[PDB]
From a paper:
Here, we report the crystal structure of HHARI in complex with a UbcH7 ~ Ub thioester mimetic. In order to gain insights into the molecular basis by which the RBR Ub E3 ligase HHARI recruits the E2 ~ Ub thioester intermediate, we used an E2 ~ Ub thioester intermediate mimetic that is stabilized by isopeptide bond formation between a lysine residue that substitutes for the E2 catalytic cysteine, and the C-terminal glycine of Ub (denoted as E2-Ub throughout). Almost all contacts between UbcH7 and HHARI involve the RING1 domain and the Ub molecule projects away from the surface of UbcH7, adopting an ‘open’ conformation that results in contacts to the UBA-like domain of HHARI. The UbcH7 and HHARI catalytic cysteines residues are separated by ~ 54 Å, thus, the structure suggests that the UbcH7 ~ Ub intermediate can be recruited to HHARI in its autoinhibited conformation and that UbcH7-Ub binding does not induce large-scale conformational changes required for thioester transfer of Ub from UbcH7 to HHARI. While the Loop2E3 region adopts the same conformation in all HHARIAPO structures, comparison of HHARIAPO and HHARIE2−Ub structures reveals a striking conformational change in the Loop2E3 region that is centered around His234 and Gly235. This Loop2E3 conformational change unmasks an E2-interacting surface that is buried in HHARIAPO structures and results in positioning of the loop closer to the surface of UbcH7 in the HHARI/UbcH7-Ub structure to facilitate additional intermolecular contacts. Most prominently, Lys96 of UbcH7 projects towards an acidic surface on HHARI that is unmasked as a result of Loop2E3 flipping upward towards the surface of the E2 compared to its conformation in HHARIAPO structures. The model reveals that the Loop2E3 insertion of the HHARI RING1 domain (His234-Gly235) sterically clashes with Ub in the closed conformation, in particular residues Leu8 and Leu71 (bottom).
RBR E3s are a distinct class of Ub E3 ligases that harbor three tandem zinc-binding domains termed RING1, in-between RING (IBR) and RING2 (collectively called an RBR domain). However, rather than facilitating Ub discharge from E2 ~ Ub onto target protein lysine residues directly like a canonical RING E3, E2 ~ Ub binding to the RING1 domain of RBR E2s is followed by thioester transfer of Ub to a catalytic cysteine residue in the RING2 domain similar to HECT E3s14–21. HHARI (or ARIH1) is a member of the Ariadne family of RBR E3 ligases, which also includes TRIAD1 (ARIH2), ANKIB1 (KIAA1386), and Cullin-9 (PARC). In addition to the RBR domain, HHARI harbors an unstructured N-terminal domain rich in glycine and acidic residues, a UBA-like domain, and a helical C-terminal Ariadne domain that is characteristic of Ariadne subfamily members.
Author numbering:
A (entry chain E): 4 to 154
B (entry chain F): -2 to 76
C (entry chain B): 100 to 172, 180 to 394, 401 to 554
Amino acid sequence: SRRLMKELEEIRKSGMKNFRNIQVDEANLLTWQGLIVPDNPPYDKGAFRIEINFPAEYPFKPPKITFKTKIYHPNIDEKGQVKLPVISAENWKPATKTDQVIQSLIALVNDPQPEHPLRADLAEEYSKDRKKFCKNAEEFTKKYGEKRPVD
Amino acid sequence: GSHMQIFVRTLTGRTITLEVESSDTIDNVRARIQDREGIPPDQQRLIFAGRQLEDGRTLADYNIQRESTLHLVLRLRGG
Amino acid sequence: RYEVLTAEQILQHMVECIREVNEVIQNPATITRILLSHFNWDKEKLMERYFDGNLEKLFAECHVINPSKKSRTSAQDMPCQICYLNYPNSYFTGLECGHKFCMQCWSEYLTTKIMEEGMGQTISCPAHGCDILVDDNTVMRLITDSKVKLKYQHLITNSFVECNRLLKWCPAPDCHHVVKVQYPDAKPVRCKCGRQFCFNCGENWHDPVKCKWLKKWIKKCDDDSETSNWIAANTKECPKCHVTIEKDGGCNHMVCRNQNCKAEFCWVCLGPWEPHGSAWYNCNRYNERDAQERSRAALQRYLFYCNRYMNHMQSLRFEHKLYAQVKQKMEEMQQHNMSWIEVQFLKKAVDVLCQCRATLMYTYVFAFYLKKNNQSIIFENNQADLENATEVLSGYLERDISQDSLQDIKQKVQDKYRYCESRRRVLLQHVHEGYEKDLWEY
Ligand SMILES: [Zn+2]
Ligand SMILES: [Zn+2]
Ligand SMILES: [Zn+2]
Ligand SMILES: [Zn+2]
Ligand SMILES: [Zn+2]
Ligand SMILES: [Zn+2]
């Protein structure tokens, strides 16, 4: 609760190019909300809302990210879960700043990887029929994805 | 082709010398290491000047001049 | 035939092996810990690979990197980078990489890696990209809780034990000690804490049954459908007055809590007690088409043998309570007369009571996998002769011991517990001799 005061302070100052509208529940700094804007298709047509849930033992135990906005991705569960090794159990380092994790989630969004997916069906489609994928995720961003911020 | 000479520090600390070109893809480098030291390009992580050298770009994108040093680190476990 | 060592004693005998292996290799002592634990502590095999080539693959495969050796190249508030607090440099200590962190955060990190999802041997500096190991010294120096220090001292030495044929841990939960024998003989050992476990398999001492069979039993119960039914021995009802009765002690010889229905019966079979031991009464024996009826008949057969094993389970745990009441039946009795020869004869009796119960549990395991042979019915008799002898010895040390005088407890119990072990004697002598001729399997 002392480090989170300085981390969230660093985001509001230097600013995050891929992360906007960082609004959190006050007093209780265990749950965060934010809106992600990818830079590359088929997702660069909308914006998706994530929710961070820092556990009590932060930063000696890593947070958990869940997608509130539905998304078409092989490494993202339908509920919103995400397999990310940089916040996994046997990999988590307490020095890892939060903004460091977000930019590591952006890479998974921009360039997915199907070798270890959460939805194998979409993982097959991304590797075999790319054009069918970039069209489904295109239509899936338009329907469920929220609008991109102005500037 | 005597266009670029770079150094890479291995896991055991030994620093081997590679020869490449300024317009060489970064993926090409991760392959030469495999033929040289036997580490697959999946189990590799290249660090220069602090930030990670992901595969997909080229040597020219990073300010990597001749006679530069490059570090080889392990990649994250079981994702 | 028995030697018990401490956790650190093993670690000393292991770090000495790490030292001699290392001086030809010249690798940080933390690294060589991994490499040998990778080669299953075959010292010669790591030598060969190192005397050959292809080391970067070995380092990559074992996920371990050497640090830049520090040899080449004080009271100020520098900010910490894990908690963002201001402490003097006296508080910060870091590994070979130069990542200095406050000893406070170090203690939480090191402990949360040992105590949570176990990190065996492979803790690294907690600085993002840093993957350099944490030496044993800087763990023992930064941790105060000895229970953590003892667990870490078990993790980093675990590989050295299992890979050694003459070493085995003790199944005790928080006891981190090792038994060393001259050769694996599937014999029981003392743990320095009263744990008598089979050195071969690693479970409790299974005198009648073989090691491989008991493993199949536990695995069968844990896997499917049996982890839910084993909680059924809590309460039953009187087979005559139909009042709900809850079993308290280890003895099965129930007697209804009713002045109008003083019926004495059996907890397992719900039959009257007096006939137990007669010629024409068996509550330990089974002795009982389509393919669907073939499976349901074999399932109820398991429930017959599993219910016996699970009942003697809780009944053994209920008979460990006697040890607390034996010391209340060893003081004033030593106060009255003849101290500390008549009181140790009373503990040797309850020691046999719990021993005949432990072997009784495994009696049904060995019996479940038996083919109905000419030696099966002979064995069943030695089982019923022991199961009854135990219920008498356990029944006396739960009700009939207080209502007696001291001039009688001496001869009462001594005749009981020595007869009770005489039935375990003939039972074990039978199956051991029957083992030598291969007279019963499956
Ligand atoms: Zn700190
Ligand atoms: Zn470090
Ligand atoms: Zn022990
Ligand atoms: Zn065994
Ligand atoms: Zn009754
Ligand atoms: Zn009975």
